[PDB]
Design a protein around this ligand. Structure first.
Ligand SMILES: Nc1ncnc2c1ncn2[C@@H]1O[C@H](COP(=O)(O)OP(=O)(O)O)[C@@H](O)[C@H]1O
Length: 252
């Protein structure tokens, strides 16, 4: 629950939630579409809608994850979130899954206009100050830009720094041992969900070096530097599934 400025923005999409609606959330990458959907998915809706997350991307086999296309269209038979849809043809074939039920949609494409698209707002100058203050201590409205800005120097003046170059600005302050592990996310598909334990054994074999213990600390710091997003946690090993943002992936 570390989200700012989306209290009034989520309610607007909640009032949107007459048998099956689309509800598309349009916005440039890094604006907070996945973050807003998480706030909406976990908003007090126990008495309203069940509730499962289905992450797709630019990549039919995701039907079975809770419990041959004919078998994939019969046993699928509420509110379910679609994380990232890239084209109209991707939704025009997956929609025949399970027809007061709704489906939440977030995407970066305005061409996916299916029924008025709710364009996500930008953080104001005051709400951006709150996000930067809490993400550094604990610029133009883009939350990803505010997130990438990692305070490596805590001096009396930080005016020396007043989206690729912002990633480079946090990339230049990374130690040499962390650069090879951060760029290794380019060897995986765009938006790939990498298991943390598997990624650690891959870093050891690649020569990025007890070794499995400090490799987690390399992953913890990259998350602390706000460069790697943790998707799933647990109680046996904490960080379970992680991924890198699509804008940070273009840099890798
Ligand atoms: N309202 C917000 N408050 C705090 N952090 C945010 C907010 N919106 C986005 N972020 C941060 O930006 C990063 C990437 O945003 P993301 O949800 O991927 O946007 P999109 O879904 O539009 O690509 C996330 O790690 C998240 O922490």
């Amino acid at each position: 629950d570390d989200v700012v400025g989306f209290d009034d923005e989520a309610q607007t999409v909640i009032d949107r939630l007459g048998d099956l609606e689309v509800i598309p959330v349009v916005g440039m990458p890094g604006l907070g579409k996945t973050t807003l959907a998480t706030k909406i998915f976990k908003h007090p809706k126990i008495e309203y809608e069940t509730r499962l997350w289905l992450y797709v991307s630019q990549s039919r086999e995701l039907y079975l994850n809770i419990i041959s296309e004919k078998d994939l269209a019969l046993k699928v038979q509420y509110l379910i979130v679609l994380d990232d849809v890239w084209s109209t043809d991707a939704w025009d074939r997956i929609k025949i899954a399970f027809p007061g039920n709704r489906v939440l949609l977030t995407t970066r494409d305005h061409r996916v206009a299916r029924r008025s698209p709710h364009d996500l707002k930008f953080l104001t100058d005051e709400e951006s100050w709150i996000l930067l203050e809490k993400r550094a201590f604990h610029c133009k409205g883009l939350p990803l830009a505010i997130v990438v800005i990692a305070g490596a120097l805590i001096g009396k003046s930080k005016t020396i720094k007043e989206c690729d170059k912002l990633v480079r600005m946090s990339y230049d302050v990374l130690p040499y041992d962390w650069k090879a592990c951060f760029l290794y996310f380019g060897t995986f598909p765009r938006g790939y969900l990498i298991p943390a334990r598997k990624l650690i054994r891959l870093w050891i074999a690649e020569g990025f070096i007890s070794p499995e213990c400090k490799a987690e600390e390399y992953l913890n710091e990259l998350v602390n530097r706000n460069l790697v997003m943790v998707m799933q946690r647990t109680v046996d090993g904490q960080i379970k599934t992680c991924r890198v943002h699509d804008m940070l992936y273009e840099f890798c």
